[PDB]
Design a protein around this ligand. Sequence first.
Ligand SMILES: Cc1cc(N2CC[C@@](C#N)(C3(C)CC3)C2=O)cc(C(=O)NCc2cc(F)cc(-c3cnn(C)c3)c2)n1
Ligand SMILES: Cc1cc(N2CC[C@@](C#N)(C3(C)CC3)C2=O)cc(C(=O)NCc2cc(F)cc(-c3cnn(C)c3)c2)n1
Ligand SMILES: O=C(C[C@H]1NCCC[C@@H]1O)Cn1cnc2cc(Br)c(Cl)cc2c1=O
Ligand SMILES: O=C(C[C@H]1NCCC[C@@H]1O)Cn1cnc2cc(Br)c(Cl)cc2c1=O
Ligand SMILES: [Br-]
Ligand SMILES: [Br-]
Ligand SMILES: [Ca+2]
Ligand SMILES: [Ca+2]
Ligand SMILES: [Cl-]
Ligand SMILES: [Cl-]
Ligand SMILES: [Cl-]
Lengths: 479, 480
Amino acid sequence: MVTAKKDENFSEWYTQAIVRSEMIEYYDISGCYIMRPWAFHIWEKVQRFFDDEIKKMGVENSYFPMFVSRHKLEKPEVAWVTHYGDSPLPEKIAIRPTSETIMYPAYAKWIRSHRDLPLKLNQWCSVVRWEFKQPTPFLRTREFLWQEGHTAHATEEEAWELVLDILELYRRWYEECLAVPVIKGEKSEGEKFAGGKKTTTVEAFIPENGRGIQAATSHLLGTNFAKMFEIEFEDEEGHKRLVHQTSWGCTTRSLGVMIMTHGDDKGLVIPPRVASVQVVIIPILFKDENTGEILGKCRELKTMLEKADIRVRIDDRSNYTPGWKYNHWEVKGVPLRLELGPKDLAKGTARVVRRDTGEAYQISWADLAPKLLELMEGIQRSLFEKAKARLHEGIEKISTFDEVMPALNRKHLVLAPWCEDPESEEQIKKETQKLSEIQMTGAMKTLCIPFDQPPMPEGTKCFYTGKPAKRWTLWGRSY
Amino acid sequence: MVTAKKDENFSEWYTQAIVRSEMIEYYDISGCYIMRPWAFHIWEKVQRFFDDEIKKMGVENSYFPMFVSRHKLEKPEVAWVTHYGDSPLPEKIAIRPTSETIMYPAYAKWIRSHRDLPLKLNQWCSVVRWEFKQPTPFLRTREFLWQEGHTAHATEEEAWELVLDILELYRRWYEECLAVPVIKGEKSEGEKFAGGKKTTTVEAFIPENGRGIQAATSHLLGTNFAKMFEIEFEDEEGHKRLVHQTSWGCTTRSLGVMIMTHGDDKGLVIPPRVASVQVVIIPILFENTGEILGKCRELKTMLEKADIRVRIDDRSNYTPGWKYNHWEVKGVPLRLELGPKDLAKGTARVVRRDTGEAYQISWADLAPKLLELMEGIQRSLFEKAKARLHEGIEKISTFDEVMPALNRKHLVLAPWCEDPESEEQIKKETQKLSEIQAIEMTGAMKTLCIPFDQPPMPEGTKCFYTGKPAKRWTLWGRSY
Ligand SMILES: Cc1cc(N2CC[C@@](C#N)(C3(C)CC3)C2=O)cc(C(=O)NCc2cc(F)cc(-c3cnn(C)c3)c2)n1
Ligand SMILES: Cc1cc(N2CC[C@@](C#N)(C3(C)CC3)C2=O)cc(C(=O)NCc2cc(F)cc(-c3cnn(C)c3)c2)n1
Ligand SMILES: O=C(C[C@H]1NCCC[C@@H]1O)Cn1cnc2cc(Br)c(Cl)cc2c1=O
Ligand SMILES: O=C(C[C@H]1NCCC[C@@H]1O)Cn1cnc2cc(Br)c(Cl)cc2c1=O
Ligand SMILES: [Br-]
Ligand SMILES: [Br-]
Ligand SMILES: [Ca+2]
Ligand SMILES: [Ca+2]
Ligand SMILES: [Cl-]
Ligand SMILES: [Cl-]
Ligand SMILES: [Cl-]
């Protein structure tokens, strides 16, 4: 069970939560962890939703090799294979950190005419970024699972609308499945993906350590990579034009984020929409009191709730006390826990405890399926809405730079008018980092320029340079 | 179009077929190939089938790192990571070729009491087996996708029952989804997984080189790994015992097999159950308004409501007949032709890809009859294959009848004594008999499997080689 406290020592709390809930297991190679079934259930669920939604868009899944030649890569932190067994490769090959240098030549080969567009591929794989720093399970790891999508189109308007559609699917992944609120915005030109035209992004906020984290990203690559890799088509009139590319990505970091958003001092709290066990049925057995009837009814209740597509498990393992089972499913975060013991056998009801709030209900057996649907909807919405309020309580609207340092001290982000000069963002990072040193990184940086822009009074000056401000920008310490 | 002929030039036919089908793209690193959507949808299909069945058996999914210490790996085809950027690494690390050494330490840590058993885990991933031999797409490659399942049980009976259940799921994977017939059997103690106690397998046959190929595998590991890694539990009486483990896998080789099992001189054929598109609607077009396309879209929704997978090929500059050949090569089980004649009679022309038989169907009658055909197709494809299979097996009793059989690209079902010595001697002698034939891919014949279904073994029957008392019948032939 979890001993540490979320608002007192976040780091050890998080470690305990993930470990005690059986989601991860440590490994002798630093930077890689093991994803036990409990976490992978959740992953499977969001992968299913994203997959169905992108298949609805014509995107098709595929698989490109893990390996890229050195020649075709330096056309850093990439991992190099030099030997098989005991013989060295004639050329070292690297392991993929992202798949552009692998797929894009194939794109060059496959695209000749307008009729071959759009071209929309996704792939669900593992990548390797071997930064020699300190990892954070889910959040920052040397190997991780993601999906990545790459499309090429005949026009930039098409590409751009797909960028937006995909980032909307990413908003739904987080807010709608994992109950984590996020912010849609656009990356600064010092933070955007280089040689993309424009990066869009969903951002999240960890209040317990006042930090920003990127959740997913969708790039408008435009035509830079087409020039690079010579991906041309012939339009209707017979002209050779460059294609307009997008790519987009989202990883298991999402599970990390969800743990921090909903976790509490007893452990995990798993939003029902992604819960593999939404309801655990715990038979209360002691002194051979009514065990045959208790199990009879528990299995009947299971078939009842399964008819309503509630995902139900009866914890009838003989070698565990009920109280151990309670703590087990609590630390694990099963949304709803249903207790049936011999005294309920004559009541015709049963006791239901919701994990998020701990409230208890006495519900009839006939009334179980619909009331449990209802509670799960309410848990899902309320997980989300409490999180969304914490998010917006953590953001401060400022006018001048004087307001920054107090705000970061309250573990908050700042929304400020900005002129969007790239060198000013770096001046800002350095200034704030040094001020932080007068007492994990202390520097503050841009997170995104929110799509949702609040009102911009005329003659608003950039909070740092005093120049005329162009857009509100979200800044904060980061992950 | 596919220039090669399937049984005349099998090699060129095979690569011609998988390339012009758009199933693979080649790559600038030997051993690796790009798996394109037309093929990956099939991998998606069988992965869903099998994932659901093992989820029904209580098996859960997980993910383990792709790297091993040399320390843990060594306790010649392994890909070794040495550097990041330009700095060496303290210790080189290896890309997994399988994940026993990655998982069993964790297992040893997670299992302490009978409470914790059985432990059932699976994972979908890829592995690297960097062999310096000539790869073959799908069939033998340097990086390939698979699933490896690893369980641990209290008793050998539970372990064994699980082994056989998984091998039956592999049977269904090939026969029910892939329409590919296979044979369940047991591996000779020479062909079994070392440090395993018994290996079971499903084998497959390729008529055009008479070659046998292992299709899936399911291992009774017993307790050897349990001693290696110290995976132990305490029973209800408090005594400390070793776990009996199983492991089992299957790869994208299953797709190559499928190709080779059903392809014809025209190209691929894909069983309806796993085909990406089940029906291609070909508009007969050359311009376009007059709404043939509208009617196509109507048909498309009518057919999706029966859960059929449909694609309208409305590409502008291609010819109807070019489209016919295109989807012919790809292997779409059913082609729906719509032109102005069909619009004027409310009928459609449907051509099944297996036999080429055509059918005229009114638009109303469309969705049911297609369902009746796909199923027919799915049965037909599997049945023909089955027959070809049984025609490539010769039951023999002497070694003399062996080398005739191999020349016909057949497999032998001979009575054997089962000491591995004899297997080794047969392999060497058959190879050099192949070479003395060749004075005028190797010729070595080995044990494919010891089939589970054993025809009657009369008393006094002598092994077809040693001449000692035969124990069981065994399937031999050349291998992949
Ligand atoms: C899981 C994951 C996820 C992500 N990202 C990046 C953006 C993205 C989003 N949205 C993607 C990829 C989806 C678009 C996402 O999820 C990044 C990393 C990572 O960069 N790992 C390497 C590493 C290892 C390590 F041991 C330590 C560090 C480390 C320590 N201090 N600092 C400053 C770094 C870094 N990892
Ligand atoms: C896709 C796949 C599949 C399989 N197998 C093996 C058994 C199994 C089955 N059933 C599994 C794993 C499921 C249990 C299966 O599918 C083996 C290989 C392979 O051995 N790859 C390396 C390699 C590279 C290479 F360039 C050439 C060769 C090569 C050339 N001649 N010879 C003798 C080898 C080998 N690859
Ligand atoms: O990987 C990207 C861009 C996009 N690729 C598709 C999925 C979503 C993703 O944002 C940016 N990026 C990020 N990290 C990298 C690390 C290394 Br190592 C290399 Cl060489 C290259 C990269 C690199 O290109
Ligand atoms: O891979 C196996 C045994 C089983 N692993 C689990 C999935 C099913 C599979 O049959 C045997 N084997 C086969 N090929 C290997 C290649 C290399 Br390289 C290494 Cl190090 C090890 C091995 C190795 O152990
Ligand atoms: Br990234
Ligand atoms: Br193997
Ligand atoms: Ca849109
Ligand atoms: Ca606060
Ligand atoms: Cl799922
Ligand atoms: Cl009773
Ligand atoms: Cl539900």
